[PDB]
Design a protein around this ligand. Sequence first.
Ligand SMILES: OC[C@H]1CNC[C@@H](O)[C@@H]1O[C@@H]1O[C@H](CO)[C@@H](O)[C@H](O)[C@H]1O
Ligand SMILES: OC[C@H]1CNC[C@@H](O)[C@@H]1O[C@@H]1O[C@H](CO)[C@@H](O)[C@H](O)[C@H]1O
Length: 293
Amino acid sequence: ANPLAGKPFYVDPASAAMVAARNANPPNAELTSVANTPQSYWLDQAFPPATVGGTVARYTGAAQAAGAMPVLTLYGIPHRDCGSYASGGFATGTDYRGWIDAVASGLGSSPATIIVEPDALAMADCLSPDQRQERFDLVRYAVDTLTRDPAAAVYVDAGHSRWLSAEAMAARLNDVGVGRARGFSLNVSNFYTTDEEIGYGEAISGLTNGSHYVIDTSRNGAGPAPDAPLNWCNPSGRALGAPPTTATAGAHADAYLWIKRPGESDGTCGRGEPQAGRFVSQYAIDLAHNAGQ
Ligand SMILES: OC[C@H]1CNC[C@@H](O)[C@@H]1O[C@@H]1O[C@H](CO)[C@@H](O)[C@H](O)[C@H]1O
Ligand SMILES: OC[C@H]1CNC[C@@H](O)[C@@H]1O[C@@H]1O[C@H](CO)[C@@H](O)[C@H](O)[C@H]1O
């Protein structure tokens, strides 16, 4: 059965969007709309192995107290973002494994949806063959360890319909034991249409023994900007996409989710824009305004 069906997705009360919406004087309809929409909660190397367990227990416990399904995004892979706008992650594979153990300890038996490492498999060719294998082994470690929470619905990140081919990504997913997870995620922090991502997802599902997937619809309401290098890096003219739901149009699509948080910068992007992750009220307002809100 679809593990995401049956409770609402958790709205994070402490998101930067919530802070901005509560501070708006006068109240701003675009910030409010965004702030009130459930979005994934991202963890990285700012949450060390020593304490991330508690952080995770707190968030899933709070979601359970709200009768809601929390979505967490794990974004701590070594050589994260290949040293680009979102450089970071843990220094070593040993650190990463310790981090995953602590995350799993904080999950316990609690309900959670886990997006495992946006871009890691799709961007891995920036690494040497040995470092790439190490990376695949770490993602597999995440799947093997996190799925010990029976109530964790785990989706390995699989890029998007214009990155690797369905065949190439399926190979990497199969390398990391996607069969043991619920499946994979698509379009994270990107802008491709839901229709496009469904066709790509159904193709990958066919190559991964009928695995299921989720699509990030946070910013895909108007499709992508014209094809160009960095068209994913704070593009203008984009719109909020479908609000999070399990009422999808794909046979193996468990949900549309907002994985990326609308308003949070993609990076400096060659234009001296805010650091990746920093909330920009203007960007959230633009995304909402472009969706007609
Ligand atoms: O070489 C990386 C490119 C390849 N083409 C597609 C493009 O998406 C990709 O860039 C990455 O895009 C994702 C969002 O889809 C970002 O999260 C990455 O930072 C970026 O490098
Ligand atoms: O998609 C992963 C990265 C790199 N490319 C796109 C960019 O928007 C994204 O940045 C991350 O965004 C999340 C959610 O807004 C933040 O929590 C991270 O700090 C940031 O690196």
